[PDB]
Structure formats: structure tokens, C-alpha cells
Amino acid sequence: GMISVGPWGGSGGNYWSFKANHAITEIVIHVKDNIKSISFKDASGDISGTFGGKDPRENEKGDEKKIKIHWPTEYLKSISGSYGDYNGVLVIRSLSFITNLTTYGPFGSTSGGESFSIPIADSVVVGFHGRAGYYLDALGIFVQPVPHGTISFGPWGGPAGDDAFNFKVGSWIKDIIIYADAAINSIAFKDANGHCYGKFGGQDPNDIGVEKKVEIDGNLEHLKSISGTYGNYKGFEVVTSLSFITNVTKHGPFGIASGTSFSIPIEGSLVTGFHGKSGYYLDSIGIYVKPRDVEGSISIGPWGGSGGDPWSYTANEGINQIIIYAGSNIKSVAFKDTSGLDSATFGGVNPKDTGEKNTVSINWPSEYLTSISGTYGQYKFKDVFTTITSLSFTTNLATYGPFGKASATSFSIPIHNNMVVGFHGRAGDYLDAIGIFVKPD
Amino acid sequence: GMISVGPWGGSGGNYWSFKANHAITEIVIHVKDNIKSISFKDASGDISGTFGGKDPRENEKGDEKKIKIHWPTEYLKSISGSYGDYNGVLVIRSLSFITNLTTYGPFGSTSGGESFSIPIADSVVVGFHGRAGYYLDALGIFVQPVPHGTISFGPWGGPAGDDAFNFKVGSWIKDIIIYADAAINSIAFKDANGHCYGKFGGQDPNDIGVEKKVEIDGNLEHLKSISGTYGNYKGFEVVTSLSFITNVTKHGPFGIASGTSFSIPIEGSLVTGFHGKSGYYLDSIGIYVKPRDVEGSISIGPWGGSGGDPWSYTANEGINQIIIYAGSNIKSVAFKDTSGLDSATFGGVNPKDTGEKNTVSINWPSEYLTSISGTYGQYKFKDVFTTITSLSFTTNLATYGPFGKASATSFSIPIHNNMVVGFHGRAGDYLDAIGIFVKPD
């Protein structure tokens, strides 16, 4: 489960990759004028084999530079460098390796090239990829988030804005509502669950702009990336255009393409959030991404009634906390994870009937969710509803609950060798129904 | 899911591996006296990068040789070669590449030490691994079964025998029964289900040997490989000693080590059967292996009564067919897979009583098993039994059943985005209990 970034450099040579089994602790380059070749080593002593360095010319050859990464206190987090001509072929000319502690390089030549850098954070480099033949034509990285982190790119745009925004979702981005004329005036977003984020921007009464929507069909499509431009608009530096890149198509552009353009060459990603600043307009924006082994999880249930609005929550890392409100039945549920991803509250919408707060703690990852059990049936307040009435959560070490009160119809899952990676169901005033997402382990 | 074989060669340099994403279609070696270096190229054009050849010497470059594999009509299945001293280092001295149609090589010096060969069959080489520094210290391969096949190794031993054996299991080897004194007189095996395999050998009326047992605890251990010796015993060429290699320990030797030794350096393998020849003694023995899954498997259930004997069945490739004999309930169920793996029959141990035969076909892989549901209740013949009363099987395309007759209590599994890879439960005269093994998709 990792995100591909890049590669940067020429289009020649053949694709290679090296996904380290253990942390990357060494990089070996041969340099003269350009980068002749690269190889790697992980913490276990495994090596990647050498990419590039293939002539037959012996001179050229290049001086050996070894770069040490002091795992675990130091880890590789990113790279920079430059590309440009060699013998007529577009290749890597210089490289720098960026850790949580310092930067190594640049190695190679700093002049006469197109340089690249990556506006990334909260990442660890767990491998490389690129192109090679006689030379290293191109180089990229594979990244995973730091423990308890979420990879982010950007933001791009200008420095101002009065309202900062920052969110991550536990399902997927389903809708994007943009207002735009020459600039992006505002953006807002909806969850798979129908939860709305923002109106970030559009505070200028004279200048709200013109509404356009992106509607993502989650059965066929997922948001993978963004691109756009930023520049002047009425004296300010703001986002002037955006496009939304999925696995199917590119939506937009929205706004008009002016100033500096930006993009992120990423694959294997799902966008799970956005951060930036807005005021009158959209000053700056960047994304949060999670790796997609989006080909992946088993779903069980839900159990319970058919009322309520459907919801789902999949952890970014590990489910840490459950907040259950209960009385005679389960009014609401909510989840938190070790990376700080907190679900909306599912249920508990009628303030006359919200029950009592219960918190469940899970010492993740040595303790982790494993199953649920409970009952469902009729519950009356003003109307009659069919809901979850009692609920328990089991881990590898413990069973928490039951919360609520037992009604006749019980439910349970005689299941083993699994972990629970998220939940789903229906909720309105109460928790109508609940089930689980599981993976082996 | 692949098995590692070898590597052969010295302990110098560093470990490396290459697992191709598509079929290996090219191999590049540099040869002078030893193999200076190696790299690979798969059908999409992706390269591995170069292992070895870090020598700063010149008449140390070696001549480049390319080997093409004419995929998909030709595929790599094995290798052979030799290793020995070069400048005081134990390295790969020569190599050959073995295909379904032909052999390429030898490349390098044959005159030189130790040769190696692999008595393998039904394999596809999907990768290599080895050790490399200045030179190519060592090489091995990763393998998978051909479609519908099972990787085999051996047999080792002498060429005669009046009887022959050849079986595979759908659980694992729990027991091994050996009669031995100076040679191996006979061998037998038990399933995890207690089903017995043969007694092969022990036909000398004057010389049957002393019994010894190996018990494998299927919770902390699994059979991985075997080794042993073969040579003369009273004018027969037979297996003289065997040991049984698990992920933890090595059980044996049984018999006495005399004549020629054999071993097969594999990792990632689960032994799933045996083949060979036997008569008075054990003439020859070989193994079947399956990759121990880097993917794990979720268990659900079982549902039903507590009576009976535990059994499990896990498909080698994918479930193809099911046989049930239920009338007023369920005497037995059985299963077949697309690789020829046939399960035992799980109860219908009463001559009297076996209901009517029912064959269910699944178009694996385009059609595949989804879940189950049934009933349990009380069934009476001579006495009273809590068994599974009726039963149904869902796939991604259809349901099959029920069989027999629905009772009071009806269990089901509200599961999605999964495939069933096997079953487990309890059986006697009837199917007391049944549950499933699932994975995502």
C-alpha cells in the first residue's frame, strides 16, 4: 500500500522499481557530470541492484558516492534534483536526498537543467522507481505516511486568507462544488456520507462567482489528484484554476488558467482531504492522500433496521476509540483513529433523545478490533423505529459492552484470523444498523 | 504466493531479489570465467537492474550475453549451473536457463567445481534471487505452479519398486509414520483430518522395520521440505534415511544416513503431498508443495452441532465442484478443485444411510463461491443428532440448493466483496457442522 511519485527526468530507457522490504539505509550513486547510476540497500543488508551505468565506455564511469540514512532515528522522506541533456538524451543530472533531519547533496551538476522538487509532507520513502538504460533517465519514489500521519501535497497558491481549512474524511470525496469566474472564489466538498465541508471562500458579496459541480461516481471512479494554476486576482495571490483528476477522467478546468501552473505526478493514491486558506477567495489549496489497495476489504452486515442514512468509516491507520451514546437503544456511534481521523457522529440527531456517553479505548496496534455483536428491535420515542438496541465491540484481547439493552433478535459473527478496519450502517435519530469492514490478520 | 529455491553458490556479497510483474522474457549475463553479473527484463519491458559487476577491474567486464524467452509460447521453468572458487571467492561459475521448449547455455566455465540441478516440475520461474558484490556469488529462482498444476520436487532414491504412490491433501501433513532400521522400510502419512495415506513399503515378509512417529502441531509448525539419503540396502537401491523439515525444527534422521544425500533448499513452501515408488522398502520419494500464502485467510463459523470430527479443506487453485448427499438432511459433503485436488468425504460413515448424490459445478474462475446458509436442527434415524439439517451454496452468479430440507434454526452470512476458498466443520455419519474460509474479491 504505497503511493508512486514522479518520476522526473527523460522518457528514455526502461522502467525499473525497487520496493524495499526494510527501511532504505543506503544510496549509492556514481556521479561525474550527470548521475550515471543508482542503487540501494535496506536495513537488513539487502541491495537493489544497479540502475543505469551501462555503456560500454569506461571512463565516463563516475565517482562513487554513498549516502547513509541513520534508521530508525533518521528516515528518507523526499528527494529533489534536476534533469537535462546528456549526449542528446534527457537524463538525471543532480540529486538530493531529504530526511527528517537534514538534506544530502546536491550530487551531480547544479547548472543548466530543469530542476524538480516535491511539496510533500508526512511521508517516508519506502522505495524508488525510474527509468534507466545507459544512464538514469528518470527517478521517482514510493511513499507511505509516517506513523500516525497522512501524506499531504501542497498547498499551492498565495500566503493570505483569513479562514484556514483542514479536513480528512473516512470514506471518499463524492462531490466538489466550485464557484469561479477568472479565479476560484470558493470550493466546498461532500463525503460519500453526505457530510459537507466548507464553503471555503466566497465571502465577497460582489464576487461569489458561478457554480459548477464535480460528481464522482464511486462505483466506477475515485479522486486521485488535482492540478491547476495560481496568480493575481484583483491584487491578491489566489488559486486561479483547478482540475480534479480521477482514474477515469480529468474534470475541469474550472476558473481560468493564469499565472503559475502546478500538478503532482502521483499514482496509486486516493485523495482523502484538502487543506489550505480562504478569505474572499480561495488563497491556497493542497491535498491529503492515502494509498489505495483500493482493491481490498470484506464487508459484513449491516444488522438492524432499514431506516436512516447509510454511512461508512474506514480508518486511515488504526481505530483507537469508540464513543457510543446509549439508553434503551443505541443512539449514536463515533470513531477515532491513531492518525487523528475522527468520524462524524452517526445517529443522535434528535436532541430530546441522545442517551449517555460511553467511551471505549483500544490500545492499537497491540490491541485491535476483531468483531461486534448485539441486538436489534423496536424502540419507541414519539414514533416506532427498528434500531440497534444493544452493542458490544470485541478485540483480540477484550469485549467492551454491552451498551444499551437487549431486545429479542441477537446478532454475532463467529469469525477468526481477521481485523476490523472500518464500520458502516445506517443512522438518523438512532443507530438503525451497523456492520464491519475486515481484512485477514 | 511463490516459493523460493536455492540459492546455490557462496555466502559472500549481499542478498537481492527480483520478482517480475509480468513473465521473464529476457536475461542478461556478463561472462568471462565466472558470471560477472545478471539482470532481467519482463514482457512489459520493465528491467531489474544489474546484480554483480561492481568490479573496478577491466578484463573483469565479461562478454554480454542476452537470453530471450519467446513468451507466451515459451516460459522459464528452471535453471542449472555450477559454482566454485574464483580469486578465492565461492561464486556462480556457469548457468543454464530451462524452458518448456529447450535449454539455453551453459554460459561460463563448466570445468569448475560443483554443479547444481533442480528435480522440479510444474513450475514457472516468476523471479530470481541471489547474492552479489563484485561478482554473482549465488543464484536461486522464485516459482509458481503452472495453471492447474502443483509444484513437485524429486523423487530421490533408486529406480525400481512394484508399487507407486501419488497424492495431495487439502489441509496439511499432521502425522508421518516411518518404519526404519538401516533403511526406510515403509512410510505413511495422516491429514489434519485424520485421513490416512497408504502404507508404502513394508512388504518384505522378513524385514518390516521398527515404527517411529513424527507429530506436527499444526498450530506452531508446518512441513516445509524433506532431506535424506539413498543407496544400497540388501541389493536394492532405496531411501536409507529421511528427515522432515518444518519452519521451526528438523525431525529425524530416521534410518541411517548412507549412500547419497539429497535435500531441496526451499522457503515459502507448504508440503501438500508425496509421490514415489515402493515395494519391500521405500525405493524413492518426492514431494508436492504449495506456496504458504503471503495473503492470509479469514475463517467464518462453523455453525451446527458440537458432535463429530474436525475437518478442513482448502483449494490448491480454486473450488470447481461439490458433492452432497443430503435427503432429510446431510450425510456428507465433498469438494473438487481445478487442479485435481479431491477432498475426502466428510461423513456418510453409516453404510446405512447416505441420501442421494448431488453434483454442483462452478465455472471457476469466472464463477466462484460466495457464502453459505442452512439449518440445524434435530435429525433422528436410530438416535437423535444436532447436525446441519439443510444447506445452500451461493456464488457470484447463482445459488445452489437447498439440499435436504430446511429446519427450524437457519444460519446465514451477510458478507460481500469476498470469495470462499474452502470449508471446515465437523462430520461423522452426518455433517454436524460447517463453516467457510474466505478472502477478498
User: What CA–CA distance (Å, rounded) separates A397 from A367?
Assistant: 6
Q: Is the dihedral of CA B50, B51, B57, B58 positive or negative?
A: negative
The percent of chain A in helix, strand and coil, each rounded to the nearest 5, is 0, 65, 35
Q: Show the cell assigned to A437.
A: 469492514
Q: Which of B295, B296, B314 is nearest to B425 (CA)?
A: B314
Contact B415 A46 (CB under 8 A): no
Burial environment of residue A310 by CB neighbours within 10 A (0 to 12, 13 to 18, 19 or more): middle
Q: Nearest CA to B3 among B149, B108, B113?
A: B149
For residues B324 and B387, give the distance between their C-alpha atoms in angstroms, rounded to a whole number.
14
Chain B interface mutation, best of A42, A416, A419, A420, highest count of B Cβ atoms under 10 Å: A416
The b/e string for B276-288 (b: 16+ C-beta within 10 A; e otherwise) is: bbbbbbbbbbbbb
H-state helical runs in A216-333: none
Contact B303 A39 (CB under 8 A): no
Name every chain B residue with its beta carbon within 8 A of the beta carbon of A51.
Answer: 47, 49-50
Among A369, A386, A300, A377, which residue's Cα sits nearest to residue A335? A369
In contact, A106 and A120? CB cutoff 8 Å: no
* In the block, residue with C-alpha cell 526451499: B266
Residue B35 and residue B135 in contact, taking contact as beta carbons nearer than 8 Å: yes
Task: Give residues with Cβ within 8 angstroms of A238, minimum separation 6.
Answer: A157, A158, A183, A184, A230, A231, A281, A282, A283, A284
Q: CA A5: distance to chain centroid?
A: 13
Residue in B47, B61, B417 closest to A297 by CB: B417
What does B338-399 look like in DSSP terms, one character per residue?
TTS-B---BS---SS-----EEEE--TTTS-EEEEEEEEEEEESSSEEEEEEEEEEEESS-E
Contacts of A53 in chain B (CB under 8 A): 50
Asked if B79 and B39 touch (Cβ cutoff 8 Å), the reply is no
For residue B4, the cross-strand partners are: B142, B267
Nearest to B48 among A16, A295, A435 (CB): A16
Whether the Cβ atoms of residue A430 and residue A309 lie closer than 8 Å to each other: no
CB contact under 8 A, B48 and A49: yes
B65: exposed, middle or buried (Cβ count in 10 Å: 0-12, 13-18, 19+): middle
Distance (Å, rounded) from C-alpha A207 to C-alpha A373? 53
Residue reference for cell 464557484: A179
Enumerate the β-bridge partners of residue A333. Answer: A324, A346
**Residue A418 sits at the chain B interface (C-beta within 8 Å):** yes
Residues B144/B275, Cβ–Cβ less than 8 Å: no
Other Cβ atoms closer than 10 A to B206:
5
Of B17, B49, B416, the CB nearest to A50: B49
Q: What are phi and psi of A175, to 5 degrees?
A: -130, 140
Residue B29 · residue B95 · CB < 8 Å: yes
C-alpha closest to that of A331 among A402, A406, A389: A389
Tell me how close the Cα of B437 comes to any Cα of chain A, in angstroms. Answer: 10
Helix, strand, coil content of chain B in percent (nearest 5): 0, 60, 40
The radius of gyration of chain B from alpha carbons, rounded to an integer in Å, stands at 25
**Any A CB within 8 A of B396 CB:** no
- Say whether B47 and A14 touch across the interface (CB within 8 A): yes
Q: Whole-angstrom Cα distance, residue B45 to residue B62?
A: 24
Best residue in B298, B418, B424 to probe A by mutation, most A CBs within 10 Å?
A: B298
Would you call A389 an interface residue with chain B, using a CB distance cutoff of 8 Å?
A: no
Q: Name the residue among B187, B180, B161, B346 with its Cα closest to residue B273.
A: B187
Residue B412 touches partner A, C-beta closer than 8 Å = no
Q: Which residue of B has its CA nearest to A295?
A: B441
Instruction: Give the whole-angstrom CA distance, residue B287 versus residue B275.
Output: 6
Residues of B with Cβ-Cβ distance to A15 under 8 angstroms:
44-47
A404 with A392: CB under 8 angstroms?
no
CA angle B290, B293, B295 (to 5 degrees): 155
Q: Indicate the DSSP class of residue A149.
A: -
For residue B25, the number of C-alpha atoms closer than 13 Å in the C-beta half-sphere is 13
Q: Which three cell numbers stand for residue B280?
A: 519391500
Subunit contact A50:B47, Cβ cutoff 8 A = no
CB contact under 8 A, B298 and A15: no
Give the 3-state secondary structure of residue A422: strand
Considering only CB atoms, which chain B residues are within 8 Å of A439?
A: 440
**Residues with Cβ within 8 Å of residue B213, at least 6 apart in sequence:** B175, B176, B177, B178
**Cβ-contact A69, A116 below 8 angstroms:** no
**Using CA atoms, how far apart are residues A146 and B246, in angstroms rounded to an integer?**
36
Cβ proximity of B152 and B122 under 8 Å: yes
**CA angle (A353, A358, A363) in 5-degree steps:** 150
Q: What is the DSSP letter of B318?
A: -
Q: Indicate yes or no: CB of A299 within 8 angstroms of CB of B416.
A: yes
CA angle A439-A219-A437, nearest 5°? 20
What is the distance between the alpha carbons of residues A161 and A100, in angstroms, rounded to a whole number? 29
Burial class (CB in 10 A: 0-12, 13-18, 19+), A391: buried
Q: What is the dihedral of CA B156, B158, B163, B166, to 10 degrees?
A: 10
**Structural domains in chain B plus CATH codes:** 1-146 (2.100.10.30), 147-292 (2.100.10.30), 293-441 (2.100.10.30)
Cell of B341: 485436488
Radius of gyration of chain A (CA): 25
**8 Å CB contact of A415 and B295:** no
DSSP state at residue A23: -
Report the C-alpha gap between A171 and B4 in whole angstroms: 39
CA–CA separation, B284 and B165 (whole Å) = 10
Question: Which string of DSSP letters, residue by residue, matches B185-198?
Answer: EEEEEE-TT--EEE
Min Cα separation B263/chain A (Å): 26
Q: Which amino acid, B243?
A: S
Tell whether B43 is within 8 A of chain A (Cβ): no
Burial of A159 (0-12, 13-18, 19+ CB in 10 A): exposed
CA distance A8 to A17: 14
One DSSP character per residue, A314-372 reads E-SS-EEEEEEEESSSEEEEEEEETTS-BPPPEE--STT---EEEEEE--TTTS-EEEE
User: Is A438's CB within 8 Å of B298's CB?
Assistant: yes
Residue in B51, B298, B417 closest to A417 by CB: B298
Q: Residues B223-244, buried b or exposed e (16+ Cβ, 10 A)?
A: bbbbbbbbbebeebbbbbbbbb
Facing residues of B291 across strands?
B269
CA distance B59 to B52: 15
Residue type, A280: Y
* Cα(B313)–Cα(B127) distance, integer angstroms: 29
- The cell for A53 is 551505468
Residue B111, strand partner residues: none
Strand ranges inside B76-174, DSSP E: 76-86, 89-99, 103-108, 114-117, 120-121, 123-132, 136-145, 152-157, 163-168
For residue A50, the 8-state DSSP code is B
Phi and psi at A2, nearest 5°, equal -150, 160
- Strands B63-68 and B24-31 come out as antiparallel
Residue type, A393: F
Tell me if chain A has a CB within 8 Å of the CB of B66. Answer: no
d(CA B309, CA A86): 72
B39 touches chain A (CB under 8 A): yes
Cα dihedral A98, A100, A101, A103, rounded to 10, equals 10
Query: Is B286 in contact with B155 (CB distance < 8 Å)?
Result: yes
Closest residue in B to A28 (Cα) is: B54
Residues of B in contact with A138 (CB under 8 A): none
The Cβ-side half-sphere exposure at B58, using a 13 Å CA radius, reads 5
Amino acid of residue B247: N
Residue in the structure block whose three cell numbers are 446431510: B330
User: Looking at the complex, does the CB of residue B41 fall below 8 Å from at least one CB of chain A?
Assistant: yes
Q: How far apart are the first and last CA of chain B?
A: 17
Task: Look up residue B294 and give its three cell numbers.
Answer: 503471503
What order do you get walking across the sheet with B114-117 strand by strand? Answer: B103-108, B89-99, B76-86, B114-117
DSSP state letters, B226-246:
EEEEEEEETTEEEEEEEEEEE
The CA–CA distances, whole Å, from B76 to A36, A187, A351, B103, B435 equal 32, 55, 68, 10, 39
Residue A351 neighbours by CB under 8 Å, 6+ apart: none
Question: Which residues are within 8 A (CB) of A57 and not within 5 positions of it... i.e. 6 or more apart?
Answer: none
Tell me B183's DSSP state.
S
A21 CB-near residues (< 8 Å, 6+ apart): A42, A44, A46
The x, y and z cell numbers of residue A377, run together, are 428491535
Polymer length in residues for chain B:
441
Backbone interruptions in chain A following residues (C to N > 2.5 Å): none
Expressed in angstroms, the distance from the first to the final Cα of chain A is 16
Task: For Cα atoms B200, B203, B208, give the angle at the middle one, nearest 5 degrees.
Answer: 95
C-alpha B76/C-alpha B64 separation (Å) is 20
- Which has the closest alpha carbon to B12: B88, B79, B93, B81? B88
* Distance, CA of B12 to CA of B34 (rounded, Å): 14
B75, three cell numbers: 516460459
Cell numbers describing residue A285: 489549496
Q: Is residue A357 classed exposed, middle or buried when 0-12, 13-18 and 19+ CB atoms within 10 A define those classes? A: exposed
Residue linked to cell 503511493: A3
**Sign of the torsion angle spanned by Cα atoms B427, B431, B433, B435:** positive
